[PDB]
Design a protein around this ligand. Sequence first.
Ligand code: ZN
Lengths: 198, 281, 208, 298, 80, 273
Amino acid sequence: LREGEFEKAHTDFFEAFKNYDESGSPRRTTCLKYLVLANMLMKSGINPFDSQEAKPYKNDPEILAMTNLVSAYQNNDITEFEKILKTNHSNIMDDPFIREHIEELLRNIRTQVLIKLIKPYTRIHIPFISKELNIDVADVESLLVQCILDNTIHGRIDQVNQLLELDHQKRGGARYTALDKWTNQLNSLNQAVVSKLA
Amino acid sequence: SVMACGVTGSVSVALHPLVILNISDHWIRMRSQEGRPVQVIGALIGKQEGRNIEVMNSFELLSHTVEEKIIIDKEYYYTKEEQFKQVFKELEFLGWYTTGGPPDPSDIHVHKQVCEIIESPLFLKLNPMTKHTDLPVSVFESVIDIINGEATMLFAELTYTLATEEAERIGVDHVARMTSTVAEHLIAQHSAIKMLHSRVKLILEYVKASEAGEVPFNHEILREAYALCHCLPVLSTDKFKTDFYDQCNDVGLMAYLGTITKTCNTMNQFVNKFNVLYDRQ
Amino acid sequence: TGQNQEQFLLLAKSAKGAALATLIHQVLEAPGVYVFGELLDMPNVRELAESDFASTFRLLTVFAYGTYADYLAEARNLPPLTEAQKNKLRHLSVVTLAAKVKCIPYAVLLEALALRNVRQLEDLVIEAVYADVLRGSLDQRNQRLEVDYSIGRDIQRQDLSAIARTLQEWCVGCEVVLSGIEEQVSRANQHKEQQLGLKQQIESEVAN
Amino acid sequence: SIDEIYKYDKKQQQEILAAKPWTKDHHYFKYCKISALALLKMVMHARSGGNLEVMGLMLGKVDGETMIIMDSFALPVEGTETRVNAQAAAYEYMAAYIENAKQVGRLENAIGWYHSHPGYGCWLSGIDVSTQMLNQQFQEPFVAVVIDPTRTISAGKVNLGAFRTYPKGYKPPDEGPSEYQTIPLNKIEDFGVHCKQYYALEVSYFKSSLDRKLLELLWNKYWVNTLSSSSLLTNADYTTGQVFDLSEKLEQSEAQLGRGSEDKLAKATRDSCKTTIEAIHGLMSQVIKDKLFNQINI
Amino acid sequence: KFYESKYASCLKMLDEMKDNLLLDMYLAPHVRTLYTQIRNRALIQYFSPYVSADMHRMAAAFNTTVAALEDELTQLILEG
Amino acid sequence: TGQKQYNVDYKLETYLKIARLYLEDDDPVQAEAYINRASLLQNESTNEQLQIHYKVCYARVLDYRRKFIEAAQRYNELSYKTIVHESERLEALKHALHCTILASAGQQRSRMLATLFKDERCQQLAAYGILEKMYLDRIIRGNQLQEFAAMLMPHQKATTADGSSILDRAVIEHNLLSASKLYNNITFEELGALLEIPAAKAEKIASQMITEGRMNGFIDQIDGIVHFETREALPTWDKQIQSLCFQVNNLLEKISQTAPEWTAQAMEAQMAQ
Ligand SMILES: [Zn+2]
């Protein structure tokens, strides 16, 4: 998790949880919390207590907060995620390993909610997204910049009018590219044909 | 003649000619097997977008007769549905077909059985022993009406149009024809225009006959001829002009590049021969 | 209209002066009845012309031939109409506009139907499409009504020739297109054979 | 008798299947008769596949040197053109379909397989040859039908071929007219490698007396569809695909002239001619429509 | 900071390193190329997600003046 | 499970009684579990009245379980049973109609709306107006919905999230889809005004329907306009040509039907040319 390999962390925490299940508590519950954290950070496991050993442990009052958080992350709900983070404050924010990645996870939900929000629009206001995602205008533009740069969002930003001009204008561009290469090749060919005579 | 015979309703039906050929082939094959005309029955599949129905394909159905009544094998249909859903995933059961004259009690009995499968099925009837000049294909919807206090099922005929699939049109044309690049390509258009010109001339002659006199005057028919006149010209908008000229310039540019390729080849032939006769390589 | 034609014609042949005069107010205030050709050509209604109920016959003439603006110009002479009849006459005026041109701007519609805001006009066009009078789509941005199909209202016994004048204009049009193909096809052969022949001459010189 | 061909004689088919005259001559089967229904169904399926290859099975019978196709049905298979004997994945489906077809009076058995070559002509690839050789080894009598739905539409003429393979080691006769087709560069190598491993049958079509009647009566209303074709945008991707291939063909013909096969430019010119001629025909139908319905006025 | 699109602090730290890296034996004869290549790339990465960008915010984000940014961009459009 | 082998009708009557009792207890899930056991026996029974009793109960279960299309189909089938009294066949038809209106939008619901619209008996029902308007893809007014809501049972007025009912939302969505068939594009202010809802709600619901794939279109938030699937350009021109030529065929058929004498007389002139 420190390096960035979330799939290898998920497998490591799964096998470690199996060994801690064979031996016993108290590291079992914490390892299960780190397993759910790795399931969410992997983007996305979304089925921790549907696997094998974690099935009856979901009812535990200590790790119930992670069940609520993994379901909120599964449905992509920021309001619910922040509500569980406010209700179960001490259960999550006391541990530094979860507190360090909680902002990355929050941004991962915000990205998907934004993707679900941009789909029906061709031109969308930035203040609207700021009020819809509940995040500062500058952080909205920063998120859109990072997201377009990583090719997750297909579109561009109009910084002057403060809007997001989404990529929609798609027509039969495939013909004009073929006609373009046909033109280039005909140019070089006619030059080579005329080159024959002297 | 127990059927609806009143107001029109529901769906706008678009029929694919593949369906007509399927039914014709079904009837021809059963007639060939039995050595006598056999009433054939089957399912109609396609797409339904609200009140727009598109009849795209069909398949034969299994039935038995109990005493004198026709019973559709429902288990066979559900088996067939599991099969056609694998190759025509986007298509749905729309109704049924059979062969013969005007609808009869047996058709109503079977239609009710089809109504046990789908809510509002279409009924298509093909007459392979037609005496008339019009296409012997009729489509019906079922209406549940009250006659002498008895709530009964009746059929109401629907108007239908033929499908617009390019490959189907070419296939149908090739089949119908069964025998220069220009001479053989514009013949189907020439015959289509000739057919249109005949219809236009017949309507025009009806108009003049009504106006001159002797022939009975009709407010309704001439009113529709007036409504037909006002439909011309079809698409005079600036967006259509931009698009039509976009099409024309695309084909035009392509034709210019093609003529360039041919001239490039003619130039190559000439130079290849010139370097042999007028030059010593 | 179709059922209403027979239903009201049955009453038209069995009605007198005042009953016919009220029947005109009943046919105009009835949904689906947009054509009055058969009713206006009746001798029973012809008797009302230049009689005690002349304005009602003039109202039927406006509903079968004229527009809403023609009614507004003669509103002092014509009998008063309810909102339903005013709407119907507006639908028929849109049909006349659609008979003239395919793409109608909102300004021409607002001026011809005597409307104030856009929604009223849009709701009237909706009522037209809903009553199977018009077919088409509304364009908000360009503020234009795109007409796909419009019904026939005017019978016009004297102006009937104009219909034929366009039908013949279409016929001649076909007659040109047809001949055009006949010629072009012929040319397409005339070239082909010629070229083949020419090739056969070139190929005959190879032996020399 | 127009409908004579529709008569199914089970005992006569069993007699032919027991006799196996095809074992006496590898060029035994010379003709391929296709029903209007099977042609329409195969072309409709081929078009439904779009730019992707699809395949299906053909039901029919044999009559002397003639193979008869009465009907066809699509197979829900992946890997047509990439997988040898891809049809095998639909074995179960084929068995059930036929079983159910027999219940409704479809008596004809498997006579062959059809597949599409969208925009690249009718012939057999290496994979097709292996598939047909397997079919002729284990499922004889069997024929392979290839359709180009794209070229059908663009040319306004049905683009179909019927083929049969030669057994491993057997050499063909002098006969091979080979009617010219434009083959794209990504396929021409494989075409050339396997073109002599099979032969083409003479294709013909048929319809019933009722089909004849119905098609004349269909025309009385189907004429409307000929004046509302819109062929230029229906399969627009074909012409663009052909131009994309033509450009690389022209690159090779330029490389031929560069330093130093037999006149690639003339082949490329015939290809560009055909593609352009099809495009102009599309415009001809569009202009005809403009002349008939737009240039009228009040 | 280059990956997070924080080009102001990125160029600030890069210019802070410049004079110290200028003293390196093998690195110095490339210090002009590298820095120009980085800056140019950053300018592209900054404008990549925009259809319409304010030149004052761009000049402030690249620690330069609007006219100098205008000249730099003109050169960047002409070839880059 | 016993040693006694009870007759089909005794078991059917008992399962029907159990199902009816669980419905009275507001436990439709348990009622459905036992009506499902009854469904396996109903065909083996020769007691027609008992078969009608399970059918009525079965439909009611489905209605109370909010399986509205399935309930509508069962109620509709009941309405055709000649052995049932006319008044009850109508009560059944009314229940089918209400369930169909309340049902989740789709092909099955649209096919049932078609079945009901073709049934002349529906013209005796107060909700016919709504049926006709829904079937014909017409915009439904607030007032008309108010009266229809008053025609419903309490369980049929189920409310999602914000106190808003399934019916309220279904009518807005129906109206949006109906408006998509009238316009190529419309402003949110206007769309809201036509649908009798706030402009933000019109945008939000249109946006939802587009994302969910139940309406085709796109939204311009700056210009405040929703653009509906136009399908215009050249394919429209081809479709308009088809409409014109189909009008030609209908006109020729009507000329031949009303006056065949002149049709043949003028038909010979085509052969004379
Ligand atoms: Zn192949």
